Scaffold this active site. Structure first.
Site, PDB file in Angstrom:
ATOM      1  CB  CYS A   1      -8.536  18.052   9.444  1.00 15.91           C
ATOM      2  SG  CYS A   1      -8.226  17.499  11.123  1.00 15.91           S
TER       3      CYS A   1
ATOM      4  CB  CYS B   1      -6.116  -4.290 -11.820  1.00 14.32           C
ATOM      5  SG  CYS B   1      -6.934  -3.744 -13.350  1.00 14.32           S
TER       6      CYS B   1
ATOM      7  CG  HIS C   1      -1.817  -1.003  -3.147  1.00 15.49           C
ATOM      8  ND1 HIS C   1      -0.898  -0.344  -2.354  1.00 15.49           N
ATOM      9  CD2 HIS C   1      -2.685  -0.062  -3.574  1.00 15.49           C
ATOM     10  CE1 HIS C   1      -1.204   0.943  -2.308  1.00 15.49           C
ATOM     11  NE2 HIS C   1      -2.292   1.140  -3.031  1.00 15.49           N
TER      12      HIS C   1
END
Length: 383
Positions: free
Chosen positions: A82, A199, A330
């Protein structure tokens, strides 16, 4: 309250499945390296901030207990439900700067419409570290830059070329080979001008840093390796109108711009004082526009910066001496800590064959889960 990075460590970032160990051992390798670098007892760690994306809410604790042994210290998961994702380093810094701890461990790890469906399959089969919208958003932003300013598709390939060339000197990078500019351009199409070698791939790996207060560093005689966080700023989504929005803004251009401006102000420095940069090149397009968002050059002048070689050795800024996300890959949770490790090594003059000679001011640009942008400035704490 001043905050210092006193030790760093990482695993090699590898193709998922290339190395046969589980996330807890990856975390242990990175964590134990960082503690050994720091020269402190494991009991000195008062809290741990742990960054990862996949798996359930206990993986952070599982990784810490395996690395350090069991204790009752707080283990904070950076990525909650949240709230927009923070970063392990930003949270660790907050704990110290707010007096909640004198010494903390930041640890990160990861172990892996027709067009959105097509991009989903492509990301899976080409092993890209991206959500399905991302190549389209970053391609749009790059195209927008070309339309406004006359940047050429080869400028984007040149950025990627430069990252792969840097990677040849990074033994922690998944990819360590130089490709020709022609090979960058000719690699498999991902979206528009964006090709596979522009990429970032998925990697598995972990990274870690020990963060400490000024009094902890003095008390323990740890001045020699202490890299000071002289500024750090996070900007979450900026809310704008239809009339003001743009593809560049939609991928966080103004968030980076504001984060960096605020760092520059806090530290009393300018872009031209920064010697070495590790930035979030998830795509070559993000690095190219980020040059202007950081204020390295005026608007629309990135192509000139690229053609002069002012993003590499012998130029004004050495950008991603690591090889970038483009070469390293990554592992979502570990990326920010690997950037930190490289910049600390640069400032400590321990970066070996990647060493930027005389580097004194380093800038980190990183993106959290959810898209928040974090910019950080580092200098040696007691030179």
């Amino acid at each position: 309250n001043r905050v210092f990075v006193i030790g760093v460590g990482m695993t090699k970032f590898e193709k998922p499945g290339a190395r046969d160990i589980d996330y807890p051992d990856m975390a242990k390798e990175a964590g134990q390296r960082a503690l050994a670098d720091a020269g402190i007892k494991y009991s000195a760690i008062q809290q741990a901030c742990v960054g990862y994306v996949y798996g359930d809410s206990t993986c952070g604790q599982r990784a810490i207990y395996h690395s350090l042994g069991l204790s009752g210290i707080p283990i904070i998961n950076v990525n909650n439900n949240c709230s927009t994702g923070s970063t392990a380093l930003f949270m660790g810094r907050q704990l110290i700067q707010g007096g909640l701890a004198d010494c903390v461990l930041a640890l990160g790890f990861e172990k892996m419409n027709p067009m959105d469906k097509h991009m989903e399959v492509m990301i899976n089969r080409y092993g890209l570290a991206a959500v399905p919208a991302a190549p389209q958003m970053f391609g749009n932003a790059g195209r927008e830059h070309m339309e406004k300013y006359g940047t050429k598709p080869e400028h984007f390939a040149k950025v990627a070329w430069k990252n792969h060339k840097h990677s040849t000197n990074n033994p922690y990078s998944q990819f360590q080979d130089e490709y020709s500019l022609e090979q960058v351009i000719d690699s498999r199409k991902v979206f528009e001008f964006l090709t596979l070698l522009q990429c970032c791939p998925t990697s598995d790996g972990a990274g870690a840093a020990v963060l400490a207060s000024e009094s902890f560093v003095r008390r323990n005689g740890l001045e020699k390796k202490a890299v000071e966080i002289v500024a750090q700023e996070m900007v979450t989504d900026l809310s704008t109108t239809f009339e003001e929005n743009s593809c560049m803004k939609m991928v966080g251009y103004d968030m980076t711009r504001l984060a960096a401006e605020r760092c520059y102000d806090t530290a009393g420095v300018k872009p031209s004082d920064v010697d070495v940069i590790e930035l979030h090149d998830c795509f070559s397009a993000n690095e190219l526009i980020t040059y202007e968002a950081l204020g390295l050059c005026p608007e629309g002048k990135a192509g000139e910066l690229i053609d002069r070689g002012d993003n590499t050795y012998g130029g004004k800024w050495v950008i991603n001496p690591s090889g970038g996300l483009i070469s390293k890959g990554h592992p979502l949770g570990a990326t920010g800590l690997a950037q930190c490790a490289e910049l600390c090594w640069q400032l400590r003059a321990e970066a070996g064959p990647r060493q930027v000679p005389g580097a004194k001011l380093a800038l980190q640009h990183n993106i959290g889960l959810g898209g928040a942008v974090v910019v950080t400035l580092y200098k040696m704490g007691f030179p």
